[PDB]
Amino acid sequence: PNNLKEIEQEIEKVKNEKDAAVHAQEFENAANLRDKQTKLEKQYEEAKNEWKNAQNGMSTSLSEEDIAE
Amino acid sequence: PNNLKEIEQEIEKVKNEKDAAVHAQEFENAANLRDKQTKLEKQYEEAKNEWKNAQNGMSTSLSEEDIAE
C-alpha cells in the first residue's frame, strides 16, 4: 500500500552511499548512514507488521463482481 | 634501524580490525581508525623516501678484506 517501496528505496540508496564511501574512506558519515539505515529497517519492519496484521484482520471473500469482471 | 619494523606493524593491525568493525556495526571507534590509518600511510611513504635519498648517492664498492672470506 505504497508504504514499503519508499523505505526499501531509501535503504537501498543508503547502502549504495555507504558502499561508495567505503572505497573513499569516509567513516565520519558512515556511522550516521548506518544509524539511518537501522532506523529505516526498524520502521520497515513495523510497517510490514502492522500491514500484515491489518490484512489478516479482514477476510477476502469472493463476490460475484470478481467473476463478472 | 627499528624504523619501519614498527610503523608497518601498526598499519597491519589497523586495517584488519577496521574491516571487522564494519560488519559488527561498531563505527564509534572505526572513525578514529580511518584517520589513524591514513596518517600512518603518509608517514610510511615519507620515511621510505628519505631513506633512499640519503643512500642512493653513495656507492658501495668492493673491498679486498672480504674477498678472501
From Swiss-Prot, chains A, B:
Q: What induces it?
A: By heat shock. Transcriptionally regulated by CtsR. Up-regulated by heavy metals such as Cu(2+) and Cd(2+), but Zn(2+) and Co(2+) have no effect. Forms part of an operon with ctsR, mcsA and mcsB.
Occurrences of domain UVR (ranges): 8-43
Quaternary structure and interacting proteins, as annotated: May interact with ClpP.
What's this protein's function?
Answer: Required for growth at high temperatures, probably by acting as a chaperone during heat shock and targeting heat-denatured proteins for degradation by ClpP. Required for biofilm formation. May act as a chaperone regulating CtsR activity.
The entry sums up its family as follows:
Belongs to the ClpA/ClpB family. ClpC subfamily.
Name of protein = ATP-dependent Clp protease ATP-binding subunit ClpC
Q: What gene name does this entry carry?
A: clpC
